[PDB]
Amino acid sequence: SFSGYLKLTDNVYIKNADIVEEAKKVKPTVVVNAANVYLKHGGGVAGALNKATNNAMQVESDDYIATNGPLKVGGSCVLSGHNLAKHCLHVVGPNVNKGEDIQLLKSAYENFNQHEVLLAPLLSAGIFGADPIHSLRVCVDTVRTNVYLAVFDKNLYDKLVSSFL
């Protein structure tokens, strides 16, 4: 199973790791993608997960959007995990760099509660522009299921652990 994680709470764990490398190693039931409403996996975690699937995630996602239309900010959809996981839970956290309501981050994390265990990034962190310390706090206060957080940046990982209340 998951190794080398620091336990933050009863159900939240954290590790300084590349979520792609973590997913290829563990092959979890669910890997969370930091998705946008259009499932356009261009950069950040989404671009990296999609590149690891040889673009199969994007092809599947475009068919999903053609059929269903875009997701809501704070919403999610379950698609294939391809070579990374059994499933990919595409979750849309608010993108602060697009003026999206940061209060939608709790709604985004509520999607994790439909899955008993997940490998995930911090929602709305990175290129989504939110404060990762705030994202971790919303995660621990919202998610009740077992969440294994992969934080790519070592310096951010150390700051998150050292400042965790």
Ligand SMILES: CC(=O)NCC1(c2ccccc2)CCOCC1
């Ligand atoms: C494995 C486990 O007990 N998970 C905790 C929660 C649960 C409770 C009972 C049945 C299934 C899920 C997750 C959903 O929110 C409520 C607690």
